[PDB]
Curated annotation (Swiss-Prot), chain A:
It comes from Saccharomyces cerevisiae (strain ATCC 204508 / S288c) (Baker's yeast). Coiled coil: none annotated. Involved in the biogenesis of rRNA. Required for the formation of 18S and 5.8S rRNA. This is rRNA biogenesis protein RRP5. Interacts with snoRNA U3. Interacts with MPP10. Component of the ribosomal small subunit (SSU) processome composed of at least 40 protein subunits and snoRNA U3. HAT repeats lie at residues 12-42, 116-149, 187-219, 221-256. The gene is RRP5. The chain holds residues 1408 to 1721 of 1729 of the full protein. It is found in: Nucleus, Nucleolus. Present with 8860 molecules/cell in log phase SD medium.
Curated annotation (Swiss-Prot), chain B:
Belongs to the RRP7 family. This is Ribosomal RNA-processing protein 7. It is found in: Nucleus, Nucleolus. One of its GO terms (biological process) is maturation of SSU-rRNA. The keyword Cytoplasm does not apply. Present with 2610 molecules/cell in log phase SD medium. One of its GO terms (molecular function) is rRNA binding. GO terms for cellular component: CURI complex; nucleolus; nucleoplasm; nucleus; small-subunit processome; UTP-C complex. Signal peptide: none annotated. Keywords: Nucleus, Ribosome biogenesis, rRNA processing.
Swiss-Prot record, chain C:
N-terminally acetylated by acetyltransferase NatA. It comes from Saccharomyces cerevisiae (strain ATCC 204508 / S288c) (Baker's yeast). Component of the ribosome, a large ribonucleoprotein complex responsible for the synthesis of proteins in the cell. The small ribosomal subunit (SSU) binds messenger RNAs (mRNAs) and translates the encoded message by selecting cognate aminoacyl-transfer RNA (tRNA) molecules. The large subunit (LSU) contains the ribosomal catalytic site termed the peptidyl transferase center (PTC), which catalyzes the formation of peptide bonds, thereby polymerizing the amino acids delivered by tRNAs into a polypeptide chain. It is found in: Cytoplasm. This is Small ribosomal subunit protein eS1A.
UniProtKB/Swiss-Prot annotation, chain D:
It comes from Saccharomyces cerevisiae (strain ATCC 204508 / S288c) (Baker's yeast). Interacts with snoRNA U3. Interacts with MPP10. Component of the ribosomal small subunit (SSU) processome composed of at least 40 protein subunits and snoRNA U3. Interacts with UBP10. This is U3 small nucleolar RNA-associated protein 22. It is found in: Nucleus, Nucleolus. Present with 3260 molecules/cell in log phase SD medium. Keywords: Nucleus, Phosphoprotein, Ribonucleoprotein, Ribosome biogenesis, RNA-binding, rRNA processing. The chain holds residues 744 to 1237 of 1237 of the full protein.
Length: 272, 196, 63, 457
């Protein structure tokens, strides 16, 4: 129960001597450790579970990088729902010093969302965008998922001007596409259409921008906005085999009266 | 068991028939492969290998890839067997600090070797299900008495002295060109780490 | 320097340290950072508090 | 001899200098592994020692080249050559000076400087938090090899005059560890300090005035002692420099601080501490737990065996007989050259040959065999053998045995990771279990001609 949620964020023994023999049999498996941590948490032995987290940092093998990365996710889960802010500021500091610090921020934001501490979360979204925003794309995307889910689309509209100021020019294509996929999935699809239109007017030769913008509209299922945008593709320059994949998406969508009109166009373009 | 062709995380299963012995009463060895993705220049066209066989050198891998090219009729050349720390001898760098186990990087000469040989591993991975008698037997190099008593043999005096003079003859001159002020800056930074 | 030399492996090694005056050079190795020196010797040693006879260990120097 | 750096010390730290060598020193019997005695070598304190460990050990090497140049220049009765020392992890540049006298004995010379500990503790300070306990093992073997062995051979050679019966008891006890295949994992000085407690603390019994009483007090004390709950603290002095109360309680604080982090004693089993070793872990780390519980268990089988069937000849025969039980596999070995005569054991070696490469013709292939088998299968297997094949290898002294135990880490299915260090077979596309028989083909093909019989579980 508690261990799978730690394994959710990362991407029968019934006594004390039960786990301690399995720690001999498995000193490098956090499934053995965290169940023995959850054995203490369900018995309300939080203080005993704090020292077991300290033992696991010195017992598990040192080449096990993602395995030791699981433990700091478990440690931040301890003093958030059982400890205080002064206990949380000590572990989170030492977690950033020892492992990759940016990955620690990505897990600790995920804990605040599940534990529903949104006032402490958006303060931490703001600080990490200050120091990791000029290099990392996903730190704006995780804050892009946060603002839309709490109905702050106008705050999720000013996210791009701060992202285009911070990210370099080679990441300007990436941050617009990732924000606008959240619009067709979680926000307003018309707001997403105002974002891809900047990429069409800036990069017409980049052909996979046309595919993503018609990937999000098939999931939108609007019958008029599909037939408009697929007709705007073919007037641009597409090669021989790539244009057939556009016919592969355009034939099967109308199947799931107007099917003879789209079969009459798929064969006129081979001769001319 | 026989239908296992590739791992969940992309490691191709590579079986091996194993040689018989006098004291022993058909077993297989399983070395697992993956394409290696790296921005490093000397780490290009490598196959990341887990669970290598015993005493696997560049020669037995040239033999085995020669068997793969002989079977599926393709072209591939082996360049260099990288990171073969079989006993744990080159795991920890001591000299840089005084100043991944059972894995390897199978370096090839070009990308056609890793594409053709990668597809040859795609076809070789299904032979556990298809034809258990068409697998390739791993012939271990077998150390006799002489190979184990080589470590009791003395050091050669002349090549050791050549290692001394050619070793110091480079570093003493280069470090002699990079003398005091730079090292005082570096150990000044070391004292900067000493204070805080 | 006197104390690090002594209280380990007595006169069988200690007098054997005294004969090629290695200890006097060890003094010179440390004194050089202050003011160098000349001839330095120890010039004298004396015994006052031998515990017991110990003939058996005394026969270790004997062949 | 005249050198650019004057020799500070030539300090012998050999077992034959502390009279614990399992074979008594026979002239020209070089086939014994206790033939070459290690000697610490110290030069004058000079800033001619570099700040990098490879160039440091190569400077020691070139100094030994000057020593070999003078020695072959003017003392050609003494023979000499060079060898590597790789028992210290990741320092492959250690070169020992092997010298053969016309008295038929051989020494290896090693060099210790003051720049050493600065570079090793410097390397510990330079290391990130990942690689630290392995450098604690390298520095621990380094301290066990160069630093405290001078005080060890000094102290045991000192108080050895007070316990004359100590030497055949400790040599016979090391032979008892040789017969039960426990000598390969346990260091010799640790077995000395375990073997010294009925002498340095005879109470409530007396000081053992016989081999029989001493060895039986050793086996009784091992069969009664619990390493988990109880420490072992030694007073290594002569009978009427002893430990005070605050130091004794400080060592007990080290034992309790060790049991705070290792309560079941998996990482550290034997705590044998004294004034020479206040840490108590210098010669007792890196040993597996079934070596400890198997040693205590065989102590209980032996002592309860003598409680049951009394003391006659057949019981003492069963004290030294390997039961070979509770192992995952058994490998029967035989070298084609028997070395019991060339180890200097009566049931004669008279000269060294003209070629030094022929000395390897009278060596132990099984020691390098089980050595590299422990080096490769360190994570997956526990491998025990007889180190002294000329003592316990039959009537010619030419047979060995590799008892192999699968660790409890690799008994079932596991998640496949790149750093697993195991010879596996998949049960699905996600989990793998250990492949026993492929390991068995690697052992048999690794020991192509000498593996005669192979028993499985």
């Amino acid at each position: 129960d508690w261990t799978a949620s730690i394994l959710d964020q990362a991407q029968a023994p019934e006594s004390v001597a039960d786990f301690e023999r399995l720690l001999i049999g498995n000193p490098n498996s956090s499934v053995v450790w965290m169940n023995y941590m959850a054995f203490q948490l369900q018995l309300s032995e939080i203080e005993k579970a704090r020292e077991l987290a300290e033992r696991a940092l010195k017992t598990i093998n040192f080449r096990e990088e993602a395995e030791k990365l699981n433990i700091w996710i478990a440690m931040l889960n301890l003093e958030n729902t059982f400890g205080t802010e002064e206990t949380l500021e000590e572990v989170f500091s030492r977690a950033c010093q020892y492992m990759d610090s940016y990955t620690i921020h990505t897990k600790l934001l995920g804990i605040y969302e599940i534990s529903e501490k949104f006032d402490k979360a958006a303060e931490l979204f703001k600080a990490t965008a200050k120091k990791f925003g000029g290099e990392k794309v996903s730190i704006w995307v995780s804050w892009g998922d946060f603002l839309i889910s709490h109905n702050e689309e106008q705050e999720a509209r000013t996210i791009l001007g701060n992202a285009l100021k911070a990210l370099p020019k080679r990441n300007h294509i990436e941050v617009v596409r990732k924000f606008a996929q959240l619009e067709f999935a979680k926000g307003d699809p018309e707001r997403g259409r105002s974002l891809f239109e900047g990429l069409v007017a800036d990069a017409p030769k980049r052909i996979d921008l046309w595919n993503v913008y018609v990937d999000q509209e098939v999931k939108a299922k609007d019958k008029k906005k599909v037939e408009d945008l697929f007709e705007r593709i073919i007037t641009k320059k597409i090669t021989r085999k790539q244009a057939k994949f556009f016919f592969n998406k355009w034939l099967q969508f109308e199947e799931s009266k107007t099917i003879e009109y789209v079969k009459a166009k798929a064969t006129e373009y081979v001769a001319s | 068991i026989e239908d296992i062709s590739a791992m969940k995380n992309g490691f191709i299963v590579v079986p091996f028939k194993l040689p018989d012995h006098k004291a022993l009463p058909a077993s297989l060895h399983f070395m697992f492969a993956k394409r290696h993705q790296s921005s490093n220049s000397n780490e290009s066209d490598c196959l990341f290998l887990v669970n290598l066989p015993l005493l696997s050198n560049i020669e037995h891998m040239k033999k085995f890839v020669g068997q793969l090219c002989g079977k599926y009729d393709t072209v591939s050349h082996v360049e260099e067997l990288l990171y073969n720390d079989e006993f744990g001898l080159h795991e920890v760098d001591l000299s840089a600090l005084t100043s991944p186990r059972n894995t390897a990087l199978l370096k090839f000469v070009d990308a056609a070797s890793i594409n053709n040989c990668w597809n040859a591993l795609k076809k070789y991975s299904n032979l556990h299900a298809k034809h258990p008698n068409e697998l390739f037997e791993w012939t271990y190099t077998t150390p006799s008495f002489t190979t184990f008593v080589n470590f009791y043999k003395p050091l050669d005096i002349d090549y050791l002295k050549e290692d001394i003079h050619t070793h110091m003859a480079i570093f003493e001159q280069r470090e002699a060109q990079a003398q005091e002020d730079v090292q005082s800056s570096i150990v000044d930074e070391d004292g900067f780490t000493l204070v805080v | 320097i006197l104390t690090k030399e002594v209280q380990g492996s007595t006169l069988a090694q200690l007098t054997s340290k005294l004969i090629p005056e290695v200890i006097n050079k060890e003094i010179e190795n440390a004194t050089k950072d202050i003011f160098p020196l000349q001839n330095i010797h120890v010039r004298k040693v004396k015994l006052l508090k031998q515990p017991k006879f110990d003939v058996g260990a005394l026969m270790a120097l004997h062949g | 001899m005249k050198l650019p750096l004057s020799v500070k010390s030539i300090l012998p730290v050999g077992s034959a200098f502390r009279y614990t060598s399992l074979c008594q020193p026979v002239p020209f019997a070089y086939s014994d592994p206790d033939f070459f005695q290690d000697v610490i070598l110290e030069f004058e304190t000079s800033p001619k020692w570099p700040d990098e460990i490879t160039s440091l050990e190569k400077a020691k090497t070139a100094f030994l080249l000057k020593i070999q140049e003078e020695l072959s220049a003017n003392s050609s009765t003494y023979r000499s050559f060079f060898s590597r020392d790789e028992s210290i992890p990741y320092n492959l540049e250690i070169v020992t000076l092997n010298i053969l006298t016309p008295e038929g004995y051989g020494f290896k010379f090693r060099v210790l400087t003051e720049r050493d500990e600065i570079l090793y503790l410097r390397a510990i300070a330079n290391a990130r938090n990942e690689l630290k306990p392995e450098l604690e093992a390298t520095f621990l073997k380094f301290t066990a090899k160069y630093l405290a062995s001078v005080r060890h051979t000094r102290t045991l050679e000192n108080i050895s005059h007070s316990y004359q019966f100590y030497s055949p008891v400790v040599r016979l006890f090391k032979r008892w560890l040789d017969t039960h295949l426990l000598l390969g994992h346990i260091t010799d000085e640790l077995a000395e300090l375990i073997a010294i407690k009925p002498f340095v603390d005879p109470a409530p019994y007396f000081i053992p005035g016989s081999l029989e009483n001493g060895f039986l007090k050793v086996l009784k004390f091992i069969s009664q002692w619990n390493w988990k709950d109880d420490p072992l603290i030694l007073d290594l002095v002569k009978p009427e420099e002893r430990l005070t109360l605050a130091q004794y309680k400080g060592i007990q604080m080290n034992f309790t601080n060790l049991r705070n982090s290792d309560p079941n004693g998996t990482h550290l089993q034997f705590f044998v501490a004294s004034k020479n070793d206040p840490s108590g872990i210098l010669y007792s780390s890196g040993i597996p737990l079934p070596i400890a519980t198997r040693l205590t268990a065989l102590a209980k089988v032996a002592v309860n065996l003598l409680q049951t069937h009394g003391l006659n000849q057949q019981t003492i025969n069963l004290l030294f007989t390997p039961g070979l039980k509770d192992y995952d596999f058994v490998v029967d070995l035989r070298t084609p050259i028997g070395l019991k005569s060339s180890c200097g054991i009566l049931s004669a070696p008279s000269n060294f040959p003209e070629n030094l490469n022929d000395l390897s013709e009278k060596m132990d292939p099984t020691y390098q065999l089980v050595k590299y088998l422990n080096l490769k299968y360190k994570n997956s297997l526990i491998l025990s053998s007889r180190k002294y094949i000329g003592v316990n290898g039959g009537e010619k002294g030419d047979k060995n045995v590799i008892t192999g135990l699968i660790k409890p880490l690799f008994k079932g299915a596991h998640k496949f990771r790149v750093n697993l260090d195991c010879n596996v077979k998949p049960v699905d596309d996600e989990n793998v279990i250990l492949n026993k028989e492929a390991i068995f083909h690697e052992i048999a093909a690794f020991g192509n001609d000498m593996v005669i019989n192979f028993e499985t579980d």
